[PDB]
Amino acid sequence: KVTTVVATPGQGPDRPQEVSYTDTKVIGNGSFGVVYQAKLCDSGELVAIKKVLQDKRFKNRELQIMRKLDHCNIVRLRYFFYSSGEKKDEVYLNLVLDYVPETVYRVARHYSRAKQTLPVIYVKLYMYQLFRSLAYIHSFGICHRDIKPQNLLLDPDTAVLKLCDFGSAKQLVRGEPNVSYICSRYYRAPELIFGATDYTSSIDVWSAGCVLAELLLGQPIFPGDSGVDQLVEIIKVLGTPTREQIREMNPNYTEFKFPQIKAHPWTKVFRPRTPPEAIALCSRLLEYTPTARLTPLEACAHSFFDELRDPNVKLPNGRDTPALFNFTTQELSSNPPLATILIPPHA
């Protein structure tokens, strides 16, 4: 069964094209509608169609953001078009994206069921690629707002990570308020747990540190039954924030959940047989103070990733490491002189 739809390229000139696809399989659900997997008849390559119900008296925020993005470690928007259900009003915006077979969550989840830890090289590979994607969208002022392992796609063979689900991403315009019940809990920055609406892109940096620590520990570092319990578990490990730290997180609130609980060391948080520059990265990612957290660009050049910058380092299945040095000037803009470290010898 071959379906032919008139789709506009998600990057290219505004030139609607006949796109034919088949093998339509549902893969995902959500707030927005439904996610499918499909095969382009002509090129035979697999794609994902994210189908959202669209009201025409406001443009889809995700769509405006997708048509401005293009990176190695981000699922690219190939096309978009409009469908409908039965009656009219009932307009569906459909996003044709690249399909990536696996996700970090489902990888991380197995090793955990096998009582095993993910090999450290995969931690470095997947965190570095995530940082690159973060430094790129933050250079536009776009904040994902929903970093979680299930929103990171992986190819098992090439070890390529591609960030997906831009449903909660938003251009942060300074002076416009921004909501605080964003982020998929567990990875919900301190500022948002206290209900701050004056946040920056560093909330993705926090969420990334929660993803890093989860891959190191083999389970979510900051669990919790609600937004309140997330604060308990953060305070359990990072201690009660100082009142200066509280002022920097949210310039609004403090309704003491309970008392000051103090911190316990990073060394005692993780497994003993795995404490290298990985613990130093977590201590630079998971800080209360938003301006004290690393930039995704500064995180890529951290000591923990230095194995990947070696010209001789090779993937576990013997293959080459995927592109880890093909930066743009937009991606380097926050700190251009960091290219000293980012681009090693080796071409």
Ligand SMILES: COCCNC(=O)c1nc(-c2ccc(S(=O)(=O)N3CCN(C)CC3)cc2)cnc1N
């Ligand atoms: C709304 O936000 C974005 C929604 N998602 C995307 O856009 C997107 N999703 C994926 C994806 C990858 C893995 C899986 S899976 O859990 O490993 N698995 C589930 C069932 N199935 C039989 C096998 C696959 C599910 C989906 C890939 N590329 C995408 N472009």
